[PDB]
Symmetry: C3
Amino acid sequence: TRTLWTTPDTSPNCTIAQDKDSKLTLVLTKCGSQILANVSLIVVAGKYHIINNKTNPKIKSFTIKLLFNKNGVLLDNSNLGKAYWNFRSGNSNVSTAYEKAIGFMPNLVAYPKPSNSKKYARDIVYGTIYLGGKPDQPAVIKTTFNQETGCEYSITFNFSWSKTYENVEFETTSFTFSYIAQE
Amino acid sequence: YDTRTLWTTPDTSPNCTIAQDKDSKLTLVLTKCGSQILANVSLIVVAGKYHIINNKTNPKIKSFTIKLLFNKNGVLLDNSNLGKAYWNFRSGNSNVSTAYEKAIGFMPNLVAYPKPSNSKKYARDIVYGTIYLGGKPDQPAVIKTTFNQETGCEYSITFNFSWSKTYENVEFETTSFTFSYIAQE
Amino acid sequence: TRTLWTTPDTSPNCTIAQDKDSKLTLVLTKCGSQILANVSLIVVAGKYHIINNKTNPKIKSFTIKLLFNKNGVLLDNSNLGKAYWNFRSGNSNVSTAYEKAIGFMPNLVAYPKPSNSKKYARDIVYGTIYLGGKPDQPAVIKTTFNQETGCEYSITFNFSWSKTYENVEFETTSFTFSYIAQE
Ligand SMILES: CC(=O)N[C@H]1[C@H]([C@H](O)[C@H](O)CO)O[C@@](OC[C@H]2O[C@@H](O)[C@H](O)[C@@H](O)[C@H]2O)(C(=O)O)C[C@@H]1O
Ligand SMILES: CC(=O)N[C@H]1[C@H]([C@H](O)[C@H](O)CO)O[C@@](O[C@@H]2[C@@H](O)[C@H](O)O[C@H](CO)[C@@H]2O)(C(=O)O)C[C@@H]1O
Ligand SMILES: CC(=O)N[C@H]1[C@H]([C@H](O)[C@H](O)CO)O[C@@](O[C@@H]2[C@@H](O)[C@H](O)O[C@H](CO)[C@@H]2O)(C(=O)O)C[C@@H]1O
Ligand SMILES: [Zn+2]
Ligand SMILES: [Zn+2]
Ligand SMILES: [Zn+2]
């Protein structure tokens, strides 16, 4: 129960533009009050698989959202599929879907839901990853905690780039970050 | 201090003094993962000289420092910029009710990061990161964290915030950054 | 056995271009399914000790390799010397070489060895460190998992820079990252 993850294989588990067009590899490891997170993305098909901004000047970003209920269970309207998001067992998952993962949720006092109170930037982490592992192909991964509506907690990953990439496949290096846990 | 968390609490009540009393909330979370401490930090400035940055009217205002000084037992000293009242081991979204007396396992390692001396000062006692003001991607600032370089204490963690862009009336409140350091014990 | 490391003093323990020309400080802490890593480097002598790209325009990168066998034991072709890598015991290392550390190896499903199949970028993490701690002296540390031959697992650090440095001592700030563990 110390690690929630997508499993480390490369089987598509995420829908960005079309069904199962990407494998989001996400590992959440609970280190007490902080969750240590490691993430990467491989797009395998669809609109975001091969980026060509000469042809499509406007395709410059996309978002992957993980929505969770009060028990920390993933809601089906998340881009990530519920099928293989579970507690780890070896290189796979436990046989049964979990019913509670509140200790992996982002803290609501640190990262409040939208309200009419002042919105602070501490609920965002910025990182840079590299497409195809090439140092001159950076893309920004912006992670935001608890800013989606229709859920009790949320983790969203926005990927964007500013260079005019020509036939660059969207598959990334890995990024680590952490966040304060709800409990 | 097996896997405990030493923190500032996650609320937004000012707990730090940069230029004037209680002008900011430093949110700092230190979690012990054996020989390394996993740290998560962000800063909200609410008043004073560093609250709203205008480098067109004040081009020389480009950096400031927040210092956490600790004694031989890992206890935070009162002359640190961070206040002592809400820096303690975590209990729910708050702190345990007794001030801690020992936290040596959360201190930066003295062999990895020696106190100042006339021996060579190696760069490994610094970690650099970039955070963003207001969560805007076009508003970077550098957070430089240095271990054990202050005097008047046994251990120290110093945060230096600086920026090179010429900001015009930009509120200094930041995104979060994670780093780790080698623990003393 | 929760931390494998190099002792964080300044005694040389690594051979880049000549014997014991550097001190790699590496700490690997097992946080369950993820290893939390912290690395820095001091070059004390030889070719990479003082960088002068006016004198040597093409000296712009070097690599430090850690190669491990099936039991997670460091192999002698690694740049890091075997006498310097062991589980922590206070501020030093245990007195006898360890026999197993498979739980510290980079996961082979997440990071496969080279083969005929498509190679994904998720087996790389990029970071930037700073020479002499100066903010205007960045160098890239690229860390790759399980891409070397002659071993069962590997962690390799490639240090490179794009600026023309003139008489700059190669000793760095520290970088943290994590990776998915084998067991
Ligand atoms: C710690 C850090 O982030 N260092 C940066 C560094 C500093 O921001 C700068 O030296 C502070 O004055 O900048 C580096 O890039 C320089 C580069 O920055 C671009 O944004 C700008 O468009 C260029 O004109 C040029 O200034 C540097 O090498 O000094 C990068 C380094 O990582
Ligand atoms: C992994 C990394 O930090 N990548 C950098 C990248 C590399 O440092 C560089 O390409 C060598 O591999 O540099 C990036 O920035 C570039 C500058 O170094 C260069 O001076 O100017 C470029 C544009 O003219 C560019 O800005 C890059 O290639 O995009 C930034 C990237 O994070
Ligand atoms: C979150 C992050 O990486 N932010 C970058 C920022 C963004 O990449 C960019 O604003 C998105 O469009 O870019 C910064 O640097 C800019 C350069 O990428 C650009 O080519 O030139 C700009 C000046 O005209 C600027 O230098 C930025 O906006 O400051 C750097 C920042 O870290
Ligand atoms: Zn593809
Ligand atoms: Zn304000
Ligand atoms: Zn010398």
